[PDB]
């Protein structure tokens, strides 16, 4: 029968095209590849296309040729895998990059809801995981077993990496789209302004109160990493109030440098100047006056800084 013979012959060429793709035989591939078989499927097993097999067996040049000659990057096998699944499962970085360049869907789900990242994570393909994340892969998506790529990552280091890089790329993408709400959401758990639950002190409050020799460098680093210079604790003390009351004059200057408000009032209506005056810290008072602290401010108890201070403080203050 003419129709049946044609089917058998086509099936033969098809089997051999698949074999050439699988083995990386470029000559054989280009001899067998036609518009009628470029997206053929194997008869048995997963019924892979030539692209699935070239991707899974790291046949970079075959992948290029298939895509150049009409191969479907989105072609599904019997289980719903796309070729990106195959490349990622086996850690083929160059192939993965090429499939993504040709429009492969980074979170494509097969019939068990496995994504390419499930594959790369589960088989510890560290570099490919990073690549996938940079293209928007989401490692929190669960398969049919309820497992995410994070759940499947075989090491704590890879798990940490998936989460960190996912947050990082999410932040970048939100910034690219100027998506203000997503930017805020990705930054929700930054620790720089973490507050001690009771007293509402931040690392900057702690730093400026520290007795240890590196407090100046530590406060400076915190401010560079985004510490709020005017954060108030439970008693409405800013870091300036804290530094002023202990005469930590080195850190006071960095606070001023970073825009610390001189006339912030604590819960008693006191400035940093009141607190310096009350404690008898002469140089602290001079520094605070030069920064533009207002000496006339009257505390809740009815006192100016001068009214709370010793003779030497009073002299400093009437010069202003």
């Amino acid at each position: 029968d003419p129709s049946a013979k044609a089917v058998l012959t086509g099936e033969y060429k098809k089997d051999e095209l698949l074999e050439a793709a699988r083995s990386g035989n470029e000559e054989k591939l280009m001899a067998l590849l036609t518009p009628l078989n470029v997206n053929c499927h194997a008869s048995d097993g997963r019924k892979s296309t030539p692209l699935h097999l070239a991707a899974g067996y790291n046949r970079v040049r075959i992948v290029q040729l298939l895509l150049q000659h009409g191969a479907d990057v989105h072609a599904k096998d019997k289980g719903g895998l796309v070729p990106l699944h195959n490349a990622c499962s086996y850690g083929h970085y160059e192939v993965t990059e090429l499939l993504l360049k040709h429009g492969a869907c980074v979170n494509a789900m097969d019939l068990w809801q496995f994504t390419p990242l499930h594959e790369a994570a589960s088989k510890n393909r560290v570099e490919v995981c990073s690549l996938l994340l940079s293209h928007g892969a989401d490692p929190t998506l669960v398969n049919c077993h309820g497992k995410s790529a994070v759940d499947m990552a075989p090491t704590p280091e890879l798990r940490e990496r998936l989460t960190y890089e996912f947050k990082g790329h999410s932040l970048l993408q939100a910034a690219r789209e100027a998506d203000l709400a997503k930017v805020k959401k990705t930054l929700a758990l930054e620790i720089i302004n973490f507050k001690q639950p009771q007293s509402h002190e931040t690392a900057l409050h702690c730093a400026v109160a520290s007795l240890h020799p590196k407090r100046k460098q530590v406060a400076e680093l915190l401010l560079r990493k985004g510490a709020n210079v005017n954060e108030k604790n439970k008693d409405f003390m800013t870091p300036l109030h804290v530094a002023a009351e202990r005469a930590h004059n080195d850190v006071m200057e960095v606070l001023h440098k970073h825009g610390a408000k001189m006339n912030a009032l604590d819960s008693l209506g006191q400035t940093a100047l009141h607190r310096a005056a009350l404690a008898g810290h002469l140089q602290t008072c001079r520094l605070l006056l030069s920064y533009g602290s207002d000496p006339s401010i009257i505390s809740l108890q009815g006192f100016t800084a001068a009214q709370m201070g010793n003779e030497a403080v009073q002299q400093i203050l009437s010069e202003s």
Partner: protein
Amino acid sequence: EDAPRPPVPGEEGTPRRSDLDLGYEPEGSASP
């Protein structure tokens, strides 16, 4: 699908637990 998932084509280039010894739950309850 719930059928077993075939391998991907390619190649590289009250006690706490009934099964094992993890001890016992504390006595109490979330709602007495």
